[PDB]
Write a protein that binds this ligand. Structure first.
Ligand SMILES: [Cu+2]
Length: 106
């Protein structure tokens, strides 16, 4: 089905993120780590630092045949995606498509 596994449909509190996680922070309309590289099976967390809501989304054909739109995080919410397959995955923020980043899975 999908190259990815979503954990929780819902955003979790940043207080729920584990200490050893790879975390991509979001501040000032930017993903703070624009290119992160993990191994298949690892989970990436995004944590929104600001009051502007931000999500993580994938166009069609990137993590599956369909498009994927994560739920919106408000301030200090976090969001997790587990990447099962090796590859390069671009995401963007649905209401702010100039916000982009990528995950390299190997
Ligand atoms: Cu955004």
């Amino acid at each position: 089905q999908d190259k990815i596994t979503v954990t929780s449909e819902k955003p979790v509190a940043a207080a729920d993120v584990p200490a050893d996680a790879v975390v991509v922070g979001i501040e000032k309309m930017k993903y703070l780590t624009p290119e992160v590289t993990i191994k298949a099976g690892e989970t990436v967390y995004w944590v929104n630092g600001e009051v502007m809501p931000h999500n993580v989304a994938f166009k069609k054909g990137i993590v599956g045949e369909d498009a994927f739109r994560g739920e919106m995080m408000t301030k200090d919410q976090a969001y997790a995606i587990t990447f099962n397959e090796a590859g390069s995955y671009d995401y963007f923020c649905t209401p702010h498509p100039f916000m982009r980043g990528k995950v390299i899975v190997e």
